[PDB]
Design an enzyme around this catalytic site. Structure first.
Site, short mmCIF file in Angstrom:
data_model
loop_
_atom_site.label_atom_id
_atom_site.label_comp_id
_atom_site.label_asym_id
_atom_site.label_seq_id
_atom_site.Cartn_x
_atom_site.Cartn_y
_atom_site.Cartn_z
N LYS C 98 17.23 62.61 -38.59
CA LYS C 98 18.37 62.28 -39.09
C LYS C 98 18.28 62.66 -40.29
O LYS C 98 19.45 63.34 -41.36
CB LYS C 98 18.84 61.17 -38.67
CG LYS C 98 19.24 61.29 -37.05
CD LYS C 98 20.80 62.54 -36.67
CE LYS C 98 19.99 62.42 -34.85
NZ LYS C 98 21.39 63.59 -34.49
N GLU C 120 29.23 58.74 -37.84
CA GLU C 120 29.76 57.95 -36.44
C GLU C 120 28.03 57.48 -36.05
O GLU C 120 27.16 58.61 -36.94
CB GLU C 120 30.16 59.56 -35.44
CG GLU C 120 28.84 60.41 -35.31
CD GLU C 120 28.59 61.29 -36.82
OE1 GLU C 120 29.64 60.85 -37.65
OE2 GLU C 120 27.61 61.87 -35.88
N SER C 387 11.28 63.84 -32.13
CA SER C 387 12.52 63.68 -32.64
C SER C 387 12.58 62.77 -33.51
O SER C 387 13.06 62.37 -34.90
CB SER C 387 13.49 64.44 -32.13
OG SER C 387 13.83 63.34 -30.58
C1 P1T Z 1 23.17 60.51 -32.08
C2 P1T Z 1 22.09 60.09 -33.42
N1 P1T Z 1 20.77 60.42 -32.20
C3 P1T Z 1 20.87 61.67 -31.44
C4 P1T Z 1 19.08 61.99 -31.26
C5 P1T Z 1 18.61 62.82 -30.70
C6 P1T Z 1 19.77 63.49 -30.57
O1 P1T Z 1 20.74 64.58 -31.87
P1 P1T Z 1 20.62 65.86 -32.01
O2 P1T Z 1 21.62 66.19 -32.92
O3 P1T Z 1 20.47 66.93 -30.01
O4 P1T Z 1 19.40 66.29 -32.89
C7 P1T Z 1 17.55 63.16 -31.17
N2 P1T Z 1 16.19 62.27 -31.21
C8 P1T Z 1 16.84 61.10 -31.86
C9 P1T Z 1 15.77 60.52 -32.63
C10 P1T Z 1 17.96 61.06 -32.11
O5 P1T Z 1 17.97 59.50 -31.70
C11 P1T Z 1 22.70 58.77 -33.77
O6 P1T Z 1 21.15 58.18 -34.32
O7 P1T Z 1 23.93 58.17 -33.91
#
Ligand code: P1T
Ligand code: PZV
Ligand code: PZV
Ligand code: P1T
Ligand code: K
Ligand code: K
Ligand code: K
Ligand code: K
Ligand code: K
Lengths: 249, 404, 405, 249
Positions: C98, C120, C387
């Protein structure tokens, strides 16, 4: 010439027996009570008294001694109480060595502590966490003040380190530890004729008798603390039993 | 760069400074066989290219090295307009510098044929790193941790258990780092033939002070290259927090022979050095034998260990590593106290200025760097070892700032 | 150089695959002034070398990029003897991918003269990242988070507060991600004059799907170089988990034009797609307008949103980004469900085999890779986007595996 | 041609008054009760009724309407109930337009929904989250089925978007919005003659009369829900007061 404890093991060999080496920590359950207990050890037949110096972090001690020395420290025991205990033992006709970890000696000063232990009548020093590799100041103090130096050997000791450790000892060698205790004694007897004390969690007369069949001395400590905790009469009785056990040889 | 020794190495017995006698092996004979066995194995493997290749491969692809060096420009106004550079060890895998030492020692443990690895932990970062490498290499793992530390570092307890390491809570003594070391020591004495002791700080008997420092030297070697590339010169000062000394000696070592570079270690002063509730080993301690080495420690007049106190679990230790005692005697490094309040202020400040939540340990270094920036003035370059991130400390810090 | 507007970008209206296709702007007119202003600002700065230098400088020295690529050899036997390569976004500052998008967007918010940033969050990683950049850049920060998520991701709530951000617990609807998005949305429409909305996934109205994807492209760009270095060829597959779609699109994009590289996104199936407690937007959803874009969502026969469920807060979302819809319709990417149980199994396997505690989101991608490895067979090279790290999920994982009571 | 709502605003202008446009959500507090309330609005002087389609995620609605639509959805309200409400309003002599977010229309089918709305007597559609940029399908169905298309303009609307939005609207333009409302109406008047309705949280006769000075239509919604929640007589009383406010003489 000869070690301070030499004559003590000589008198035991002539009587076809092992020496009874009893340990008690200074200041448990208090300083006056511990000195009365150590005097009782001399009266009840201990040939050598190990006077233990309570230490804050006794990593080599079992739960019985570790909790007693911890209680002694809660009561404010000081290192000078150990020297006062050695003097009382010598006056009572006993033969006292001091068993201590090394930092209390470093803090006191190695030479000053050797001098003051000698003046109290002490005959030697047992150093469970001082190996000959670090013992430069102690060797000099041991010779200057005519004190025995009892190092420890272990079952895991390499042959080279066992030889160097035995060579550096005076008085006796503390064989700290199945069949490993006689084997460890045999490895010492193969390189020297110095007496060998054996500590093995001795609790009974029979155990002392077994060890006396191959060891020059039998070291009892944890069981003596357990007996003193029950009471001074219990310590007297147990020390008597052990005194008879070392004569079974 | 572990293959080549240093001019600052101890003798064969592990002594720094010749006659001063810092270091050594103040241990029972019962440990000497395994202690010599680890020493010989380390001297063999440190020059083995296969060993060095495995270690480097893990530092790059697994741990995430090199860690970056970041100029925290928003701190400058709070540090007398000096330039604070953060060595970002918080970004390593598991979240601290401890993984550097553990990867080295864990690979060594496998090379020696040991089937079991034990370790102490205070903040839980060495425990997590050790658990991490034992999971990765397939080794049985047991971590000893003071009962007080299991409570205030509970995040790391659960990380260790998820990683498949056993965690033994230690209830003796002060129930903190020194008591965990005592209990793990006893384990090693009993199980030496098959157990490797992965020690987590730059203390203990030889070879641990030297071996730990050698595995942590990568920090300062990177930092020395990175500061010159970014700032165009060597720093005016390199600072770090000092518990046992591993992250500090790691970042200091590459600069030892740079005469213009000030080296400052910051130790935990707890409630204040005059209150008897601190861990400021150099400020208030004295020389002695403790946990296998001759160094400084907090001790009373008879030589009994005085229990330490610090809000930071990782600095809550009354000892310090012998190479630091030597460096203090030589005048090469200065050691200064930082209190609980100073550390927590720097903690909050780093959060709000730079968006970095540090370990409370590392916050002591930031706090001291702020004071050193005021002393050195505008434009001075100060490298700070940010030893870990503060996820483990978030509960403590939120409670401190009223954010619950 | 700079990755110019390649052939995968939407039209000027934000539509993928035709002027009335996926994406667009299904928003009230009350937001079009600030949406057009953000779109113009992004179009200006995405071609500015000084902006890309600022982003690159923060990525290298502040965020720790590049992230390594790690071959998890001890997973191979559980993956049909395929070779699993982990792209270690878990090692980024704050602990997830993120931060890549937040640094881009916070730099943009600063370029626009905005002083207040809102966002959010579901798992709390995008909220922590946003709060991190706002502290770093001196911006006021307000994070909206569903009340259910503030309980299961409480570590990130406290992190956000220590970073000086206001955290607003959202109690409407399902009290999860889609409801936090609704509340952050209401904040934006009221404060559209001074507040920048830092959206954390590759969804929403134009330009958010494209801008978020562009800031995450660095993941696949690095991984494509790293995998050729380590395996000596392009992978047989690249996989990621799919919530809104940012981390998946971030690693997929560099590989879109490599026709031999399979692309699989794994979505959260909760208790199972047949139970009605899932978040399998592509498996069980249908096209519709939701959260500012035309894409897939879980909806009933009237078009009402079906509340989603997942043990993973970050995947617990009934929608998905419009570019993923386009790639699915085109057949370039396959999307498959992974249940809670499959993900927690992969979570624990990664812990004890590789010593990596993953985010429960990321555990879904690992679980899908294990299955994919069985399908592809021995020697297959599978790149997995790890991720995030799982510090936020330690309590959840501890309960799941009986480490509590 | 002329817009479906053109005669209404013509008649209101001929009587020196603004049109009273009343909003109620279908199915609150239940489907029959909401139909009775919408009929009551016709009988109490509402010129145009906005029939609201309850939506699961209504991000543009205030808490009063958000809670009411949540309750309607818990009760099982269907989109087809909005069409039935339009029929009942047509049968009662009223004039109804539907206000809905766009996704329920997409799920229904845009052409199909436009066909059924016109068949039920509906006159138009208010689309709060459909901007003309995405309204290609709706523009075609709006012309095919002769439905008015009420888009929204905002105080923040750029001059270009305000003009394009007005040009795209038929019937009236919704000026959604403390003097921003009259100057927003003025910006629409500067480019077109289309009637302009104003929503402004009207709660009283006084507020409705303020809006009637510059606006062609006064839009009330939240206050009607609040009144209905108390009871149908309270709704009739409030609507009577509001119909007095939109009249100037
Ligand atoms: C929703 C958010 N997280 C989604 C998330 C995801 C899924 O969100 P994506 O936008 O699909 O990557 C994958 N891996 C981690 C570590 C995540 O934190 C958040 O932290 O607000
Ligand atoms: C009081 N004297 S003691 O009980 O014999 C004694 C001697 C030595 C040590 C301990 C107790 C505990 C710690 N210690 C060590 O050597 C050590 C330190 C760090 C890492 C590995 C170690 F092995
Ligand atoms: C039901 N129709 S709605 O209430 O008008 C409506 C329209 C649009 C959107 C929302 C509600 C919530 C989210 N949303 C967005 O556009 C959006 C998404 C991600 C980031 C920023 C955004 F602005
Ligand atoms: C005590 C251990 N940590 C100490 C520590 C220290 C102090 O230990 P050093 O060995 O002085 O570096 C500094 N920074 C962090 C993040 C730490 O975790 C431990 O995790 O067991
Ligand atoms: K002892
Ligand atoms: K293990
Ligand atoms: K610079
Ligand atoms: K020491
Ligand atoms: K989803």
């Amino acid at each position: 010439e000869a070690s301070r404890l030499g004559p003590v093991f000589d008198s035991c060999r002539a009587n076809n027996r092992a020496a009874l080496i009893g340990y008690l920590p200074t200041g448990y359950p208090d300083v006056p009570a511990s000195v009365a207990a150590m005097t009782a050890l001399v009266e009840s037949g201990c040939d050598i008294i190990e006077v233990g110096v309570p230490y804050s972090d006794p990593g080599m001690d079992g739960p019985t001694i570790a909790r007693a020395t911890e209680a002694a420290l809660r009561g404010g025991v000081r290192v000078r109480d150990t020297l006062a205990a050695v003097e009382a033992i010598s006056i009572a006709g006993g033969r006292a060595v001091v068993m201590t970890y090394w930092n209390p000696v470093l803090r006191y000063g190695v030479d000053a502590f050797a001098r003051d232990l000698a003046a109290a009548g002490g005959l030697g020093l047992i150093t469970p966490d001082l190996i000959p590799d670090e013992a430069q100041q102690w060797l000099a103090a041991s010779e200057e003040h005519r004190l025995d130096r009892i190092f420890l050997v272990a079952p895991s000791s390499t042959p080279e380190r066992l030889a160097a450790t035995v060579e550096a000892s005076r008085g006796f060698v503390y064989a700290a530890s199945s069949q490993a205790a006689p084997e460890l004694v045999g490895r010492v007897k193969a390189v020297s004729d110095i007496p060998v004390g054996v500590g093995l969690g001795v609790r009974s007369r029979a155990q002392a008798a077994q060890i006396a069949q191959y060891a020059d001395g039998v070291i009892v400590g944890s069981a003596l603390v357990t007996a003193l905790t029950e009471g001074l009469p219990r310590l007297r009785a147990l020390t008597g039993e052990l005194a008879a056990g070392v004569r079974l040889g | 760069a572990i293959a080549e020794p240093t001019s600052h190495d101890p003798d064969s017995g592990g002594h720094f400074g010749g006659p001063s006698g810092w270091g050594g092996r103040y241990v029972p004979e019962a440990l000497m066989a395994v202690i010599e066995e680890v020493t010989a194995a380390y001297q063999k493997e440190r020059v083995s290219q296969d060993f060095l290749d495995d270690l480097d491969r893990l530092q790059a692809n697994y741990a995430g090295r090199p860690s970056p060096l970041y100029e925290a420009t928003r701190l400058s106004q709070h540090a007398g307009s000096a330039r604070i550079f953060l060595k970002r060890e918080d970004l390593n895998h598991t979240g601290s510098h401890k993984i550097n030492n553990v990867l080295g020692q864990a690979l060594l443990a496998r090379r020696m044929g040991k089937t079991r690895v034990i370790a102490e932990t205070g903040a839980g970062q060495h425990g997590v790193a050790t658990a991490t490498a034992c999971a990765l290499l397939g080794l049985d793992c047991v971590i000893y941790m003071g009962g007080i530390d299991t409570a205030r570092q509970a995040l790391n307890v659960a990380r260790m258990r998820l990683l498949g390491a056993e965690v033994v809570a230690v209830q003796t003594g002060s129930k903190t780092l020194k008591d965990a070391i005592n209990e793990a020591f006893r384990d090693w004495v009993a199980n030496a033939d098959n157990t490797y002791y992965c020690f987590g700080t730059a203390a203990g008997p030889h070879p641990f002070p030297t071996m730990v420092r050698d595995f942590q030297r990568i920090i300062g070697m990177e930092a020395r290259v990175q500061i010159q590339g970014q700032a165009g010169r060597l720093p005016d000062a390199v600072v770090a927090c000092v518990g046992g000394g591993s992250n500090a000696i790691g970042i200091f070592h590459a600069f030892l022979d740079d005469p213009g570079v000030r080296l400052v270690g910051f130790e935990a002063a707890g409630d204040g050095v005059e209150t008897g509730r601190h861990a400021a080993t150099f400020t208030a301690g004295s020389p002695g034998a403790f946990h296998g080495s001759f160094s400084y420690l907090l001790q009373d007049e008879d030589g009994q260990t005085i229990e330490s106190h610090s809000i930071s679990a990782g600095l809550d230790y009354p000892g310090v590593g012998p190479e630091h005692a030597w460096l203090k005697e030589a005048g090469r490094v200065d050691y200064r106290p930082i209190t609980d309040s100073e550390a927590m202020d720097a903690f909050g400040l780093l959060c709000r200025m730079e968006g970095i939540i540090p370990a409370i340990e590392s916050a002591h270094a930031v706090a001291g760097a702020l004071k050193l920036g005021v002393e050195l003035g505008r434009g001075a370059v100060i490298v700070v070892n940010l030893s870990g991130r503060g996820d483990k400390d978030v509960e403590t810090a939120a409670k401190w700032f009223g954010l619950l």
